[PDB]
Amino acid sequence: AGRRAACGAVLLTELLERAAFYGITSNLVLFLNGAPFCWEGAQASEALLLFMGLTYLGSPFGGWLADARLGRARAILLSLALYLLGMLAFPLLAAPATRAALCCCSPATFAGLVLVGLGVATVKANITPFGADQVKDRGPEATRRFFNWFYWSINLGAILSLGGIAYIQQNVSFVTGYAIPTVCVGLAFVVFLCGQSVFITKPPDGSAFTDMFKILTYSCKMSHGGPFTEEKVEDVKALVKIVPVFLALIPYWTVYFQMQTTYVLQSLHLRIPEISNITTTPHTLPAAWLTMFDAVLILLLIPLKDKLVDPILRRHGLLPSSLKRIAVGMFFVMCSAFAAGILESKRLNLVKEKTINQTIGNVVYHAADLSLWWQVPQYLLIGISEIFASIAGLEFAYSAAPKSMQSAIMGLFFFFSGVGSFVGSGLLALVSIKAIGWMSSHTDFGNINGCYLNYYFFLLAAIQGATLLLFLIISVKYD
Amino acid sequence: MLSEGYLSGLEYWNDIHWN
Amino acid sequence: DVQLVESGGGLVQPGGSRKLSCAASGFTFSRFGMHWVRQAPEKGLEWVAYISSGSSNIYYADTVKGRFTISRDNPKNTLFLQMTSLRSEDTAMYYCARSTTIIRAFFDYWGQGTTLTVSS
Amino acid sequence: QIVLTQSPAIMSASLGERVTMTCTASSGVSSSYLHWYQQKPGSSPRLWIYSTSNLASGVPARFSGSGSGTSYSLTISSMEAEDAATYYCHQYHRSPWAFGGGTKLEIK
Secondary structure: OOOHHHHHHHHHHHHHHHHHHHHHHHHHHHHHEOOOOEOEHHHHHHHHHHHHHHHHHHHHHHHHHHHHOOOOHHHHHHHHHHHHHHHOHHHHHHOHHHHHHHOOOHHHHHHHHHHHHHHHHHHHHHHHHHHHHHHOOOOHHHHHHHHHHHHHHHHHHHHHHHHHHHHHHHHHOHHHHHHHHHHHHHHHHHHHHHHOOOOOOOOOOOOHHHHHHHHHOOOOOOOOOOOOOHHHHHHHHHHHHHHHHHHHHHHHHHHHHHHHHHHHHHHHOOEOOEOOOOOOOOOEOOOOHHHHHHHHHHHHHHHHHHHHHHHHHHHHOOOOOHHHHHHHHHHHHHHHHHHHHHHHHHHHHHHOOOOEEEOOOOOOEEEOOOEHHHHHHHHHHHHHHHHHHHHHHHHHHHHOOOHHHOOOHHHHHHHHHHHHHHHHHHHHHHHOOOOOOOOOOOOOOEOHHHOOHHHHHHHHHHHHHHHHHHHHHHHHHHO | OOOHHHHHOHHHHOOOOOO | OOEEEEEOOOEEOOOOOEEEEEEEEOOOOOOOOEEEEEEOOOOOEEEEEEEOOOOOOEEEOOOOOOOEEEEEEOOOOEEEEEEOOOOHHHOEEEEEEEEOOOOOOOEEEEOOOEEEEEOO | OOOEEEEOOEEEEOOOOOEEEEEEEEEEEOHHHEEEEEEOOOOOOEEEEEOOOEEOOOOOOOEEEEEEEEEEEEEEOOOOHHHOOEEEEEEOOEOOOOEEOOEEEEEO
């Protein structure tokens, strides 16, 4: 039809770029504890946390760069090129032949990580408005159908990534398991460039973030006859009202982003089931599959909550408010952190006496004789926390904000999620110093047995609990 | 962010006031 | 280039203490978690102790659990095994073996071993 | 606690003869973590077969590892004079990593 081709191109680019991002995040921890990189578990977790935090901090900046200048389609194109350039560094590092030419060489992998983070951030910020204005003209129902397709594309890309790419990286090889995400980024860039002919490109109107920055840099508030209009001032006031909810959600984002950086690290030191029983170097169950499981869990209860729980509660009343749902989600993620700490304490008690070796990936881990499935609850808890906090958070942020601040509220949501990831990385670094010594050692290849992830998880749970009590107090006082 | 798909089109499938 | 020498073995009265040292060269001793394995005269090999790359994982055989103590000094690239309450059955040749934390895990390199005799 | 029993504890095989020694485990041992070490008398031990299939560096091709799970085996297609030594099966899977009982191989 000449228009559904543009929507299909947007969906394909979205699927490929989510697939590559999740392929990187699923086994970056395993890769950084590898032959080229004999990093500590704390260092690998910090690197992955910083990477995710960058991917979510660049969303407001990517959106501003797309809206104030450079357009949106061209911004996504340059972001995809930058993202592919960053992706290229990973298979080269994995391959022994090319790692020598590239380079230990921590600067190379840090450059690749920051490049990939900027690309993912800009694409994440700009793709959703791009798809919307691709489909806005037909009508709100067409937009709803396209966004159903977009949601399914995102989830499908994440699922296929966390399954296939993680299995290939952990079991088959890291070179192929990192070239496949690079290949899919290449195809995403190619398909976006090809669909540039059929895309509906809008001129840069100007992001609301520059207006907010001008308001904060003053000429309540000033408003009226001064050099600023009333609606922008009211909108910035609404954003300021929204901000404390995200400030409260920051520790939730820390503990949530722990699911793929330190939870995978703890998985590497549990008895991972072996699912091949055939051929040399028998394949083990990918540590990222748990995350995939959790994602699958979301797919099985996002519609349920949208079709069974929410309508029944709406009919019967007693439906919790957005703030109450956020509090429930923070309680659930606190429970996940506490369960992770309990499991890690039991793991450290067990591994002190006996151990089992696990040559998962390409490095041998002194895992405890504890089943990996004992880590299933905490992961599931985080998933529940998601459907109770993240959505609700944004939902509340959408309730107390005007329609004009669409994609500016969402940008702030991503920014504060990235801030939570950065806070988690900084907390891990702080507890890794000699004064505290929870993660202070010289144990290469991760080898968390000498560290204390139980103390780190307990600290995260305590911070989440303090934040939850403060949130409950302020919600009761205000509402 | 496992719920990026649902957060991307949050204002479409369910009905919210203001936005 | 890689090599492992042992020292400290000798005659020890029963109930005494002795500290067997293993000097490593030709590789990065910070990596490659080490093992102490003893072989009694005309008996087979017996794994005694293991220490990880960063002393995080430390394990001993049930026969040397409460007596032997394995440690590593990375900056001077050495492996220590200090043993107390020595009895007669501890008389053996001790080797410091190198374990790999790479695609395959095994005792790739062994030292010549040092003989410890616990008798009178 | 896995104990490895080697059968036979001692055997003599003539030159150019089929040689087979078995190593059974008290529990399940992953095939990738079972190794065979060769020890000459008066010399330190040496990896011979890692992951019960792959020959180590310098190992003549006549040697071959086999087996999986509980029972494994080291095999010589055609035994030669330099092959007379003591072979130990070692599981490096579950702590404690006890060695095998040993299998002394002699010329007949």
